[PDB]
From a paper:
The [name] of the [name]-[name]-2 virus is [name], also known as 3CLpro or [name]. This is a homodimeric protein with each monomer having a molecular mass of 33,796 Da. More in detail, domain I (residues 8–101) and domain II (102–184) fold in an antiparallel β-barrel -where the active site with the Cys145-His41 catalytic dyad is located whereas domain III (residues 201–306) is involved in the process of dimerization that is critical for the function of the enzyme. The [name] function is indispensable for viral replication as it cleaves the polyproteins pp1a and pp1ab at eleven conserved sites, to allow the correct folding and function of essential viral proteins.
The polypeptide structure of both adducts is totally superimposable with the others already deposited on the PDB except for the last five C-terminal residues that have not been modeled due to their very weak electron density. These crystal structures show that gold coordination occurs at the level of catalytic Cys 145 in the case of Au([name])Cl and at the level of both Cys 145 and Cys 156 for Au(PEt3)Br. The behavior of each of the two gold adducts analyzed in this work is slightly different, but they share a quite low gold occupancy, with the organic moiety originally attached to gold being no more visible in all the structures. In the case of Au([name])Cl, only Cys145 is involved in the binding to gold but still with an occupancy of about 0.15, and a gold-sulfur distance of about 2.4 Å, which is in line with the expected values. At variance with Auranofin, a labile water molecule coordinates the gold ion in this complex. Similarly, the interaction between the monocarbene gold complex Au([name])Cl and the protein results in the formation of a mono adduct bearing the 1-butyl-3-methylimidazole-2-ylidene-gold(I) moiety (MW 336).
Author numbering:
A (entry chain A), B (entry chain A): 1 to 301
Write the structure that this text describes.
Amino acid sequence: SGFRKMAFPSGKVEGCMVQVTCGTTTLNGLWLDDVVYCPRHVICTSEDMLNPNYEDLLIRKSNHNFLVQAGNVQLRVIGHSMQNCVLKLKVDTANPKTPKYKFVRIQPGQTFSVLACYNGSPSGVYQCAMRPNFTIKGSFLNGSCGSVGFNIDYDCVSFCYMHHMELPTGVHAGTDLEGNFYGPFVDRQTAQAAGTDTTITVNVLAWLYAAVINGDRWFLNRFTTTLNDFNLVAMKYNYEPLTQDHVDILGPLSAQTGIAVLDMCASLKELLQNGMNGRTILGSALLEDEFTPFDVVRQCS
Amino acid sequence: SGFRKMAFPSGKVEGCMVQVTCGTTTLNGLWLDDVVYCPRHVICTSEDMLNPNYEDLLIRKSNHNFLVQAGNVQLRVIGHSMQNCVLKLKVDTANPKTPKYKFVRIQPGQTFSVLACYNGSPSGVYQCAMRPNFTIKGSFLNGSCGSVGFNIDYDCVSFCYMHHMELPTGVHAGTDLEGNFYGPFVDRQTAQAAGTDTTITVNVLAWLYAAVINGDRWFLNRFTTTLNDFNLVAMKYNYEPLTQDHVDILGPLSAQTGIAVLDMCASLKELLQNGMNGRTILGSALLEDEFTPFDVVRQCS
Ligand SMILES: [Au+]
Ligand SMILES: [Au+]
């Protein structure tokens, strides 16, 4: 038994992490096959970030200006192009540690594991979630740009995130592995603000289902509710509106616990209306919303 | 910026994870050099766990009774011995993915990253801490025995934990890589209880120092205190008594923030005496004590 914030084994991704140095700036790149993916702001300095015509600055850059390093080995760049906000550095030698992988753009609320990297070397791994305002609450210092978020299905490593920016409000923003930013954020240093960070409601119920099968049952209570009326209380406390799909995904969680999805919404409804009375659920004094229903069934498999 | 619960990159440890099957039971083993380390309860069934003379059951076991599997490769066992509560299965082929490693027995309060494994395959990685009652609050299902906890220093992978038991109270217990259990727990299914889980106080102050450099400063307050008098309030709320060593380890954290260690103890003292008024620190509604002072300086490096 036991429940914890778990991240995927990052071993397959560590073998894809390289260092990219373009002029004076340095960050990390994702080495898959014979292509190295890195944020396109590597071709910019601190003054360009104020407002960078990225197409103009790429005109002055050539193949030998991109230094790809994989430990004590230097990769030879023989081609480069700009795909949205990412850089595709074609190299001559393929990555021998390339795993089974795809490029998947995740949805708001889905979770993924992030490998923090600096100078192409992995520093740590933690679990993250795509907040409804299309930001993430990760740990990213300077030089962490190029770090990726991934999911692992048996043998397939599903790359989904790449760090780019840190907003002036403390959170972070980035793109998928195709270069398209998650949300209305641009790779430019300006006054960017994210929306009101609502709570992934389907991820809270899945987390409450994990507390039931682990001992924490003091929040279980003798009330039920309807989907429309629970969404009224959920909308007041800045929660995501629950849909019929979210109810279905918790089906397996409801089938094993024998607690209906609407009965869990009522118990949650009382936690929003009465608080927690100083008590804890699964070692947390607040309601955790960074566990997908699939994250629970995987940890309780 | 940003602060999160980070675990070490588990890539170096994934290359050391094998499957050990002795008779009807199966679990994971740590393949370093030509030795495979696994809990010695692999030679026991469900009925033996009631009370197992481990020396007697090992008399009936030979080399061919231990099946070591590394994916689609079977390892040949040519030697086996019992070191405390671990099993040393000598094999004929050395592990090519053996990293730089040592066997270090950590102290209560220190942190380490755990790789959850089932049937010799890594499932996830999460950060853990050695609670003062010598247990851990990890996530371990059936078949997770043999999973290890580790720290990584540049190139040295410091192995420190190996999962063995799940107590009837929900927490877990295990040994170091030399077989010696952490605490007064035995590899036997009986009525074992851990002591009162106190709070690692030095790890709370280091966590509060991380909140200062990240924005969360509402808990900063205009009071100071002494070490002896803070330990009076700390002893009431089941906290670890603060020593002069704990004060010194926070030196770097106090030097950069310009907040004295005693000033942080006073702010914490008010958090224990007044609660949190429903507010959060670093996204948590309680005081987190699973961050060593070195865990903070590493994340703020
Ligand atoms: Au960066
Ligand atoms: Au086990």
